[PDB]
Amino acid sequence: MHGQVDCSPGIWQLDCTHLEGKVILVAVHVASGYIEAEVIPAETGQETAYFLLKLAGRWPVKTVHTDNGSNFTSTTVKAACWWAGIKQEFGIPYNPQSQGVIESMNKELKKIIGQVRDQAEHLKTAVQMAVFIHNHKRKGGIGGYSAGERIVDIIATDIQ
Amino acid sequence: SPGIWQLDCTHLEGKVILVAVHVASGYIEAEVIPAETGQETAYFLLKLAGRWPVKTVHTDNGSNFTSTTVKAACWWAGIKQEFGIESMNKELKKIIGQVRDQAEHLKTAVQMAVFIHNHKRKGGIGGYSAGERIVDIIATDI
Amino acid sequence: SPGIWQLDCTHLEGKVILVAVHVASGYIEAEVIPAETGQETAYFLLKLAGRWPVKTVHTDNGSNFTSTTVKAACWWAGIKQEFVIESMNKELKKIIGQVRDQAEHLKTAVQMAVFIHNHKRKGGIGGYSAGERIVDIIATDIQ
Amino acid sequence: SPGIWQLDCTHLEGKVILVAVHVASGYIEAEVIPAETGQETAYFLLKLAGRWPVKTVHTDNGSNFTSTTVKAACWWAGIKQEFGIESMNKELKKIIGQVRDQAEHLKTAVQMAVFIHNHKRKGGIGGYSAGERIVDIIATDI
Amino acid sequence: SPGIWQLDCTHLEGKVILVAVHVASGYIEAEVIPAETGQETAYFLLKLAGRWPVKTVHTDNGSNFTSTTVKAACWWAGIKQEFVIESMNKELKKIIGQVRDQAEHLKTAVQMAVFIHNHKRKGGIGGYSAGERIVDIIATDIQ
Amino acid sequence: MHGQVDCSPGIWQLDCTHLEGKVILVAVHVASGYIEAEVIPAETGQETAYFLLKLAGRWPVKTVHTDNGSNFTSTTVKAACWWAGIKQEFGIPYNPQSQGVIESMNKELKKIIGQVRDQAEHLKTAVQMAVFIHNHKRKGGIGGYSAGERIVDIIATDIQ
Ligand SMILES: [Mg+2]
Ligand SMILES: [Mg+2]
Ligand SMILES: [Mg+2]
Ligand SMILES: [Mg+2]
Ligand SMILES: [Mg+2]
Ligand SMILES: [Mg+2]
């Protein structure tokens, strides 16, 4: 939700979740809690490669963790990470409470999607709506900082 | 490396056998599990880790091996998982066929076969059984 | 002798725990079994015998321990039967309490406690773990 | 008495946490130690003693607590050991479960939990946190 | 203000010592860290923040001090960052030399020196120790 | 070896040491350096109680220090000390050089046992032999006084 205090700014986790028979690829910036999500045509390495290339063109992605889905281990994804200078790590780090960061984000996202599903004709719309709600939510964690603000602040300081 | 093992599941008689192999010595541990599930695998691995100094485990992408329960066990035990023995499964099945008739249940035959594989004199001279080798390797390492 | 082991059953939460202690080293193996029977005891014994060179097993006159099914396992495995581990049971139960909350089923808590006991370095001027002593003892015996 | 503390070791995630409790205020200091050994405990106690006026330490007969290294530290520090909190370990573990997901490593989560336990407002009004209490007790005592 | 602390790294025997001084009182905390990194600095800072009410930390622009990992700790702990302790480092190193031979590792000698500095009564007409002033200052602030 | 110049005559320390898999209970009169040792069947509070009762029947034992072994903290030992008028203290006083009096005696005794082990069929014999050698050894400390002579001299003066 609000990220992990002991993580580096270049660490991300990715995974796919499922809703209404659709595939939702989710990425989470571990240090901040910021996510990017999107319904993809098929749970393939091709679709996955595209999403990683987009993410890398906007953020300074150093390391990505994913489980061992064939889509995540495909040569298309491997090729994509290599081109983008991304170190791929297989297996989502374990956490006794959340089970895994991306894991808790998949659940949070589905929960949010359930609250606003009534205000969207298409699931794809509800997905972006939920991501918006998640990223803009501010909580006492940091003087009223949202995950969307934390990530740009974290990356900006790194740059500076 | 003395702390490296490879796990995998194999099938016989419509049943599932979880197999563990100490890469350095060829030592084996196997068991018929009621279902090819993460909780059965996590349990097996936990027993194995409390007996041998397990540091790294290599497996295929099998759902049971990529499961959270197994991930959780390795986390508590200090084991690093790796994905990516096929002959051990073969040898094991061969030995099982050899002693199958000495037991009604495959679970018993599997244990008899592990016993045989780990204690069987190799090279025509004692001291080179998979079971003697692992003990020497681990000891020469501690 | 390094081939000697003591076996006995202990109980917790109304469950039976079969415990095996390598007398010479203190190393142990334990497991919750569905029943205090020769069938369960024999199966446990056969697994144990397949990993360590067991030559002699000392147990009480427990009904499951004096079973022909356990006797057959010993015959097959070449184990001598004779009718520390007591202390070991208290020792084990103590570690289980420390990790009990940490596991859902006593089953896995027992394995956690075994792992802890075998890999914990103490005693004898504090230096080795029971898991190191058993391998050293036996390997030396082999050497 | 403001100079009395109780130490003890507790376990979580296959790791060891050394816990120190100021009996008078309930203030806590904990840390994941690499091994339940006397040198790790003596070091922890030494840091604690150079910060708080530690006069007496109560512990169980744990080998690390009955160790010479620890005995030597208490000797140099002027601390009197006593043998013979269980709830503090419980509370600590509870708070750790509450913030566990905010860190990858338990060592970080433990410190977050100590922070939380020592600074958490109690009674619905400020000034009664374990951390505020110890400081007042020690000060009212010096 | 009683919530202000100065932090900085000093070196001895090729080892890094992270030092924290409570500006208001002179009280200090120091520790040999494996590395001059934000990860080590953040962890040290989180422990410090859990025992004293830290509000502001003044450090130089040291790479480990300007790290996002240390920034995150401060965010989490509610600490303001701003980029005496210098003198404190000389002071500390001096006490370390007096007890160095007394300890095997610099690690424990640093803690011995900290203990000595905080509990030694001097200055201001000679009367209180830095360990007494910090508790009095803060508690008063609370009162 | 030759005791501590600042100790009282009623102070003793006890501990168990180990040799050839046997348990050796050792007692040392701190003021003199005099020891009594003996192989015991098991490191129990029962065996320990017996040894304390023997010691107390011969010497004016006022205070005994021992570490926290279960044998030393057992109610049998507590009961024994109470009956004998012995104050039990837990934890062997620390000494920067010897680590602890009984500690250095355990090492001295093992060293002596090692020198004469060849002249004894049984370890139990070697143990009494080593105690004899230790207690009768005289050194410049006091005009040629051995620890065996120092203790009787110390206790005698106290009585007188
Ligand atoms: Mg997935
Ligand atoms: Mg497979
Ligand atoms: Mg029984
Ligand atoms: Mg304890
Ligand atoms: Mg600096
Ligand atoms: Mg002792």
Curated annotation (Swiss-Prot), chains C, E:
Residues 1-138 form the Integrase catalytic domain. It is found in: Virion; Host nucleus; Host cytoplasm. Mg(2+) 3 binds at residues 8, 60, 86. Signal peptide: none annotated. Homotetramer; may further associate as a homohexadecamer. Part of the pre-integration complex (PIC) which is composed of viral genome, matrix protein, Vpr and integrase. Interacts with human SMARCB1/INI1 and human PSIP1/LEDGF isoform 1. Interacts with human KPNA3; this interaction might play a role in nuclear import of the pre-integration complex. Interacts with human NUP153; this interaction might play a role in nuclear import of the pre-integration complex. The core domain contains the D-x(n)-D-x(35)-E motif, named for the phylogenetically conserved glutamic acid and aspartic acid residues and the invariant 35 amino acid spacing between the second and third acidic residues. Each acidic residue of the D,D(35)E motif is independently essential for the 3'-processing and strand transfer activities of purified integrase protein. Catalyzes viral DNA integration into the host chromosome, by performing a series of DNA cutting and joining reactions. This enzyme activity takes place after virion entry into a cell and reverse transcription of the RNA genome in dsDNA. The first step in the integration process is 3' processing. This step requires a complex comprising the viral genome, matrix protein, Vpr and integrase. This complex is called the pre-integration complex (PIC). The integrase protein removes 2 nucleotides from each 3' end of the viral DNA, leaving recessed CA OH's at the 3' ends. This is Integrase. It comes from Human immunodeficiency virus type 1 group M subtype B (isolate NY5) (HIV-1). The chain holds residues 1204 to 1356 of 1435 of the full protein.
